[PDB]
Amino acid sequence: LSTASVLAFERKLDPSDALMSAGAWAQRDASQEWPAVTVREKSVRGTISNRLKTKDRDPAKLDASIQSPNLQTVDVANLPSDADTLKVRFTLRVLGGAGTPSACNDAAYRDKLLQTVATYVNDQGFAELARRYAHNLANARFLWRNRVGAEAVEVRINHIRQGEVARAWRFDALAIGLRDFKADAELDALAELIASGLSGSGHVLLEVVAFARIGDGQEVFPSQELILDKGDKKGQKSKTLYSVRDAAAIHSQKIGNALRTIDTWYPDEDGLGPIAVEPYGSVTSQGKAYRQPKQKLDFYTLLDNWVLRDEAPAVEQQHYVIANLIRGGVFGE
Amino acid sequence: TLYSVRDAAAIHSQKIGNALRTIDTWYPDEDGLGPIAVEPYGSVTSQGK
RNA sequence: CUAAGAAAUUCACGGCGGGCUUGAUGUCCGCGUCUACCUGGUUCACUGCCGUGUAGGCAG
């Protein structure tokens, strides 16, 4: 018996597009009304400071190229000059039961995966993965470049049942560390709530409110809208920021990628900090191919070893595999 | 067109940032001119050199 | 059984120097607005001396 070839693990822990507004610190308690940060426009005259060749380039050509300016046009977004706090608000559906997919060839593989995910729900419900998701919510990983340089970052997490509240935590993202993962009673409570929310025990819907003193007038960093620019259609414009209806927003993909930094046992290194959890797991910015497929430590070959040969490595690799299936994606080519 | 914000005339942030980093006094030409801005291929483009 | 399935995609920046917009002018002529009226609106379903617990007689 072989396994299914067309498989589609689905999205789970879906965050919303984070909207940004701006106001003053210590009046953040009664703040549901702050005006949105909007993407402004300005012009740039710069030099050319990139690396330049010494072969097949004329001396007069590079003398004419360095000494002539570059006049591009970019987008920015700043806080107002009397507002020193970047508010970031988003919601987070926690669905439940990310084990089984909904695209399967083999019925025997599908209920076999149901057998092993019911085994994992039986012996221990989602505890350390819930710890790591609740701790990424606890600090400000969703604040990417908004985090560094801030003197005070607060995370407030409310839970939704009806037009009312169920619990109101309060997390100090400066006091809560960045690298070494610990556990505390509020973090235990949030990890327990979404621990119920992950194993299909019902419906969990959260909304997270963040605050950050940066300083009045400073640069915020919404995400960047992409463009191909392959050859022709060069353009007067660069740095297209991302927006919604009249506000500066962060993509769902990148705040989800901020939620999915779990793996501390990748085989390349273990003291540099965690990386992003994905098959062929390697962060995009570094470019170094972490989690080489020629070892047994993929999601592909490891799932093929774990569902046919019925053997197992240590429990942390299974935490990585269960984080892969909570992540979603494609198994097989 | 002059740069502005809501109801206020403004200087860009990078113009102030350029005026802060005018430090370099060891470009190999001379000390007769003075400090220029720190830059790779350190170029005062406003005088074309 | 949602054209099924899924995705960090980026870091840096000096726009600037200069200028004569000016000359001249007829907005005109004429006109019918008129008929009738209940604000008691409660101008807070309320303001005050007996004990600051529903515990009192006034042209309220």
Curated annotation (Swiss-Prot), chain B:
Domain of life according to the entry: Bacteria
Disruption phenotype: Mutants lose phage DMS3 infection-dependent inhibition of biofilm formation while there is normal biofilm formation in the absence of phage infection. Decreased production of crRNA in the presence or absence of phage. Disruption of the entire Y.pestis-subtype CRISPR region disrupts crRNA production but does not alter phage resistance (possibly OLNs PA14_33350 to PA14_33310, and the flanking CRISPR loci), indicating this CRISPR is not involved in phage resistance.
Family: Belongs to the CRISPR-associated Csy3 family.
Note in the entry: In this bacteria, Y.pestis-subtype CRISPRs do not confer resistance to phage DMS3 or MP22, but instead are required for DMS3 infection-dependent inhibition of biofilm formation and possibly motility.
Subunit organization: Part of the Csy ribonucleoprotein complex with a probable stoichiometry of Csy1(1),Csy2(1),Csy3(6),Cas6/Csy4(1)-crRNA(1). A Csy3(6),Cas6/Csy4(1)-crRNA(1) subcomplex is also formed.
Reported function: CRISPR (clustered regularly interspaced short palindromic repeat) is an adaptive immune system that provides protection against mobile genetic elements (viruses, transposable elements and conjugative plasmids). CRISPR clusters contain sequences complementary to antecedent mobile elements and target invading nucleic acids. CRISPR clusters are transcribed and processed into CRISPR RNA (crRNA). Cas3 and Cascade participate in CRISPR interference, the third stage of CRISPR immunity (Potential). Involved in crRNA production or stability.
Protein name in the entry: CRISPR-associated protein Csy3
The gene coding this protein: csy3
Portion of the full-length sequence here: 245 to 293 of 342
